[PDB]
Amino acid sequence: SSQAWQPGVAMPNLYKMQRMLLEKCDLQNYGDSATLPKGIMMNVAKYTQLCQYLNTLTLAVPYNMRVIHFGAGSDKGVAPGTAVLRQWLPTGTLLVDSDLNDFVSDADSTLIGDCATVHTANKWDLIISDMYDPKTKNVTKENDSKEGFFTYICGFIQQKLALGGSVAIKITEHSWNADLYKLMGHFAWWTAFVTNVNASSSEAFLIGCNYLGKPREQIDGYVMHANYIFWRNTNPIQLSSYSLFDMSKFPLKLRGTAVMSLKEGQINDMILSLLSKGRLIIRENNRVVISSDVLVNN
């Protein structure tokens, strides 16, 4: 596999076009581990490879870019993924992160609490989520679409993602949501991306590239998750840390992508085509204001 020198593997288009039934995920390389560079944590390696893959897509990168990162804490009380995002994003990018549990972070602002308590006045150019509930991994009951934070994420995308913006949302065999797959059809392009360092896990990042705010294609999320598991079940991915050793072209290119305010009636097919090419962001350019709802009781 030439794939071992890539940052990871994206779900091939033909697999997206199938109509598979959902099966249990049984990875050939389950339990194997990549050899990480000395002293480098899995979460730093994983986010580095995610960002290396996002470098290959037509991301909109405006001045004063706005990025929000959900699930950014660790059981060590630090934010390794936020540290990689801050390394990757252009200097001056506004980066906000959040987690249920307290942690210390390099983000410009951090909100502690359930993601459902997070509200923002502004729209965002990029949404990253690593949220995961390990209780979903119950091999003994039916693997149905999950709600919880996925319900929040779906609404947050529809209400607070700028047109032209993108997302990368962690899923696993058991941690997934049908509506989130359906929402992937509201972007110009989408994939499920597996990092080469964590290829022994059913984890992937569901990536929606350039948001259009309306269905471009109709996706059945139950079918699409079955398609994803079928791909993983029949395509073993060789664990690899190779791409971690060449960081010379890591930083996200500062593209100066135009930001315009438009009301829904002026989004014509010419605007939709600029959005689809990563050439336009549609949102206000006012002040970024966030808050966390606090439940007050005795």
Partner: protein, 115 residues
């Protein structure tokens, strides 16, 4: 007049043989950077490692106030370069050392302003 002196407490803990603070966030980078102490992106040279700044700050990590009137942190949101020989204890290194104000390197670990 009472103030908790966490810096002294950590130094005394280290000198008594305590294990340094762990889980400082080490970054992947080229190791062909400027080598300056505290930077907006990782700048480790061949002799350094680069770390996320908040994770190397004693006050950030211990959840205590920063020792200045404004409570501002010099590390959070930045990257700190640590000599590889000292990278087992980034918090202790940043606590014990000083940045040269003209060249931006660590005094005694890159600053050549006095030779």
């Amino acid at each position: 007049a009472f103030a908790v002196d966490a810096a002294k407490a950590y130094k005394d803990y280290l000198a008594s043989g305590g294990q340094p603070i762990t889980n400082c966030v080490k970054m992947l980078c080229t190791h062909t950077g400027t080598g300056q102490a505290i930077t907006v992106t990782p700048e480790a040279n061949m002799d350094q490692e680069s770390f996320g700044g908040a994770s190397c700050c004693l006050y950030c990590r211990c959840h205590i106030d920063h020792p200045n009137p404004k409570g501002f942190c010099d590390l959070k949101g930045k990257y700190v370069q640590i000599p590889t020989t000292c990278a087992n204890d980034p918090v202790g290194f940043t606590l014990k050392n000083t940045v040269c104000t003209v060249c931006g390197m660590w005094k005694g670990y890159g600053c050549s302003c006095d030779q």
